Design a binder for this molecule. Structure first.
Ligand SMILES: N#Cc1ccccc1O
Length: 282
């Protein structure tokens, strides 16, 4: 079925919490023993969101190598993502240790710091060129280089060094800042437009490590961007274009990290995105 015609029967037919619920239950439920250790209890932002043991990104340190993050491998498409939670006041050093270690080129941030009146993460990047940040624990220095503020998003170029060692990698931060507090945007053109910006950066490509992607829990909004991204990929590459099924793809991503796409408002939005992006894919 050509998604567009089933977007119709579904929206015509009044049923998303219908299909959302069908996705939920059929999803995978793996083990996450590392994340519940007592010793790791402050490192988690939420009680119900943790990384599965099998797909977790492991920090290369003698002490504690736990971070609440997960590696998402989409095989056919040939894309891997690092999904995660918004860093916490105390896990900011671990956040940047894992960008260093996995060799990523990009962080894609889909929320703001204070959303709905609360803090959804620590402000983990420098606000000024002149006042750099040092993560004494992980022995890393971070410095803002340049910074472009647009209407719908903000782009930043930063430098990550190993204090301990003298290596410098440049990092690009794509920040989505105009996602309303409640729901999902009324059009997907802005979202598609930011995605593409990220695709142009080198930030999602094979000669690099996987991009780190995050919101406040790392599941809802992050699941959306990724899902759109992987799907456009597949239509792009197949001999067979409406032979791309969002749901089966979503369920595959879901093999790696729990609860991606938190609401039915966001599934549906997912489908729009995708369809609208599949007119360029010309
Ligand atoms: N890409 C991709 C993908 C989606 C669903 C099932 C298997 C795959 O390799």
């Amino acid at each position: 079925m050509e998604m567009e015609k089933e977007f119709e029967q579904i929206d015509k037919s009044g049923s998303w919490a219908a299909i959302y619920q069908d996705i939920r239950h059929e999803a995978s439920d793996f083990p996450s023993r590392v994340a519940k250790l007592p010793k790791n209890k402050n490192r988690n932002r939420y009680r119900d969101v943790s990384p599965f043991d099998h797909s977790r990104i492991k920090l290369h340190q003698e002490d504690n190598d736990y971070i609440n993050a997960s590696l998402i491998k989409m095989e056919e498409a040939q894309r891997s993502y690092i999904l995660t939670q918004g860093p916490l006041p105390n896990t900011v050093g671990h956040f940047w240790e894992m960008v260093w270690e996995q060799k990523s080129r990009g962080v894609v941030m889909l929320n703001r710091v204070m959303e709905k009146g609360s803090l959804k993460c620590a402000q983990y990047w420098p606000q000024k060129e002149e006042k750099e940040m040092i993560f004494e624990d992980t022995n890393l220095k971070l410095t803002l280089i340049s910074e472009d503020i647009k209407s719908y998003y903000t782009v930043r170029q930063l430098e990550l060094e190993n204090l301990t060692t003298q290596e410098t990698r440049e990092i690009l931060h794509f920040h989505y800042t105009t996602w309303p507090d409640f729901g999902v945007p009324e059009s997907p053109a802005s979202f598609l437009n930011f995605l593409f910006k990220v695709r142009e950066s080198g930030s999602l490509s094979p000669e690099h490590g996987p991009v780190v992607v995050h919101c406040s829990a790392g599941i809802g909004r992050s699941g959306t961007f990724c899902l759109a991204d992987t799907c456009l990929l597949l239509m792009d590459k197949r001999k067979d274009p409406s032979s791309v099924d969002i749901k089966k793809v979503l369920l595959e991503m879901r093999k790696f990290r729990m609860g991606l796409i938190q609401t039915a408002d966001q599934l549906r939005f997912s489908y729009l995105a995708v369809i609208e992006g599949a007119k360029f894919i010309m």
